[PDB]
Design a protein around this ligand. Structure first.
Ligand SMILES: CC(C)CCC[C@@H](C)CCC[C@@H](C)CCC[C@@H](C)CCOC[C@@H](CO)OCC[C@H](C)CCC[C@H](C)CCC[C@H](C)CCCC(C)C
Ligand SMILES: CC(C)=CCC/C(C)=C/CC/C(C)=C\CC/C=C(\C)CC/C=C(\C)CCC=C(C)C
Ligand SMILES: CCCCCCCC/C=C\CCCCCCCC(=O)OC[C@H](O)CO
Ligand SMILES: CCCCCCCCCCCCCCCCCCCC
Ligand SMILES: CCCCCCCCCCCCCCCCCCCC
Ligand SMILES: CCCCCCCCCCCCCCCCCCCC
Ligand SMILES: CCCCCCCCCCCCCCCCCCCC
Ligand SMILES: CCCCCCCCCCCCCCCCCCCC
Ligand SMILES: CCCCCCCCCCCCCCCCCCCC
Ligand SMILES: CCCCCCCCCCCCCCCCCCCC
Length: 230
């Protein structure tokens, strides 16, 4: 507990753990193949986040990066988390709307670029170059958001109203929450260093729990995840 941000890492660990356990129990008994997919993806997201929050709490997921002539604490474990959880979250959305495979690959590929370039930016030793990587990552994010709003144009006249409804809600949650991440990065200690690491950790920890457990609660409560069955 020598790091001030430990409390947010602990709490994050606890909230992701407990969310995982709730989604394990809730999904118990589900036989519908379509619903099984959504429960698998959506359980599985906070399970990964739990391990990476734990890893940060215990100090494994932290490294020191020299830039600005200082040794800067960088939690690299975030990117290991997001590398897997953010395409899984996009897959939830894509499966909802029965997205084409081409569209799914575009989303997951862009996502991979977003997280990969975020990681390179996070570990870059030349200060000004960190923001070049930030810009590229943000461009990838904007591409993803574009596809979410303008890429499911063929899947509207055949979509079940509850699918459309739950998708629209989850898409809005996604755009609002995901758009905050580049802002937090930019102002936090990985970027401009105007907001201290402890507040920077609090902000991510609220975004993460909201984007994974919050998102999951909304999705797994909806009839949208079930095939139409009599
Ligand atoms: C998709 C789903 C169906 C399934 C996915 C779920 C599952 C695979 C996810 C579990 C997540 C988690 C356990 C991942 C563990 C990361 C670990 C392997 C990284 C090892 O890094 C080595 C340490 C040295 O001690 O570097 C520490 C110090 C270094 C000098 C600092 C720099 C390290 C790098 C920045 C690490 C980059 C993180 C990569 C994204 C990890 C890639 C994942 C892969 C190798 C497992
Ligand atoms: C079965 C039924 C009708 C309801 C069960 C719902 C349950 C039990 C959910 C539990 C999951 C859990 C223990 C935690 C995650 C809940 C998280 C959210 C709703 C997202 C919001 C959380 C935050 C924004 C972070 C909290 C912030 C601080 C400062 C503690
Ligand atoms: C201490 C509290 C910690 C609690 C957290 C520990 C999490 C990490 C470890 C193991 C389980 C990983 C399994 C997660 C994947 C489950 C997928 C699933 O739920 O699948 C349902 C689908 O219906 C099936 O066909
Ligand atoms: C949701 C919040 C759960 C309560 C957590 C309170 C524990 C506070 C410990 C602070 C010591 C630093
Ligand atoms: C299953 C094993 C659960 C482990 C739960 C969380 C560990 C808490 C970390 C130890 C703190 C020091
Ligand atoms: C980039 C690494 C890929 C993450 C895996 C989740 C993939 C969804 C499968 C389609
Ligand atoms: C081209 C984008 C199409 C998506 C439609 C909605 C976009 C709103 C989200 C944009 C938020 C971007 C935040 C970027 C960080 C910039 C730093 C200031
Ligand atoms: C249609 C209903 C859409 C409701 C979206 C609200 C999202 C709020 C963002 C979470 C922060
Ligand atoms: C269909 C309607 C589309 C909804 C668009 C909403 C896009 C708004 C994006 C919000 C950007 C958030 C940036 C705020 C940063 C503050 C960081 C702390 C957050 C906890
Ligand atoms: C939950 C998301 C927002 C919480 C922000 C809490 C910010 C605390 C600011 C600390 C003030 C320190 C600066 C004093 C000088």
């Amino acid at each position: 507990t020598g790091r001030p941000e430990w409390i947010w890492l602990a709490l994050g660990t606890a909230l992701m753990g407990l969310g995982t356990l709730y989604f394990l129990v809730k999904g118990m008994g589900v036989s519908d193949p379509d619903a099984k997919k959504f429960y698998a993806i959506t359980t599985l997201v906070p399970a990964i986040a739990f391990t990476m929050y734990l890893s940060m709490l215990l100090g494994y997921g932290l490294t020191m990066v020299p830039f600005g002539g200082e040794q800067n604490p960088i939690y690299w474990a975030r990117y290991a988390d997001w590398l897997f959880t953010t395409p899984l979250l996009l897959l939830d959305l894509a499966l909802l709307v029965d997205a084409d495979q081409g569209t799914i690959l575009a989303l997951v590929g862009a996502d991979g670029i977003m997280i990969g370039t975020g990681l390179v930016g996070a570990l870059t030793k030349v200060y000004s170059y960190r923001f070049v990587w930030w810009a590229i990552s943000t461009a990838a994010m904007l591409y993803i958001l574009y596809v979410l709003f303008f890429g499911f144009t063929s899947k509207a006249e055949s979509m079940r109203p509850e699918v459309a409804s739950t998708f629209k809600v989850l898409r809005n949650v996604t755009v609002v929450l995901w758009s905050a991440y580049p802002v937090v990065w930019l102002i936090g200690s990985e970027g401009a260093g105007i907001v201290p690491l402890n507040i920077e950790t609090l902000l991510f920890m609220v975004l993460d729990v909201s984007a994974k457990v919050g998102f999951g609660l909304i999705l797994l409560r909806s009839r949208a995840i079930f095939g139409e069955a009599e």
